[PDB]
């Protein structure tokens, strides 16, 4: 038998561990259910894919905005006040993406 939304909740925790983020418990409860029928390796892969995301955002997105400490430019649409054409945080939305892409 595989983890049950309960065992899958903690699995997401463990793999994230200390990695600087802010998914509140609420968020994990969600990713636990999204994964009904998933396995440890699965959920574990899943989380490895998320992350490496904040990095992809800055790798592909060529347009950074300043949110500054002195200065701190990051990936932005360009219709965001200040978009500076030139080549971020782990929201629950990031773990969301890598759910489909796997």
């Amino acid at each position: 038998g595989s983890p049950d939304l309960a065992a899958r909740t903690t699995m997401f925790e463990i793999n994230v561990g200390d990695t600087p983020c802010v998914l509140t418990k609420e968020d994990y409860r969600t990713l636990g259910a999204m994964t009904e029928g998933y396995s440890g390796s699965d959920i574990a892969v899943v989380v490895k894919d998320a992350l490496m995301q904040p990095i992809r955002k800055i790798q592909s997105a060529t347009h950074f905005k300043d949110v500054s400490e002195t200065r701190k430019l990051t990936p932005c649409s360009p219709g965001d006040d200040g978009a500076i054409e030139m080549s971020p945080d782990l929201t629950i939305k990031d773990f969301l993406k890598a759910i489909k892409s796997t």
């Binding site: 955002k57 592909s60 997105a61 060529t62 347009h63 990936p75 932005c76 649409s77 360009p78 219709g79 965001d80």
Partner: protein, 42 residues
Amino acid sequence: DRASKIEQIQKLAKYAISALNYEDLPTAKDELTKALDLLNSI
């Protein structure tokens, strides 16, 4: 021009893509348009 107009559509269609990476439909629907009109200007 033209050799460039054809190059600026891509420049647009890229920004548009880059924009949808923040779900910014506004920018997108615009650049993906300024681009298309221009491919007809060709």
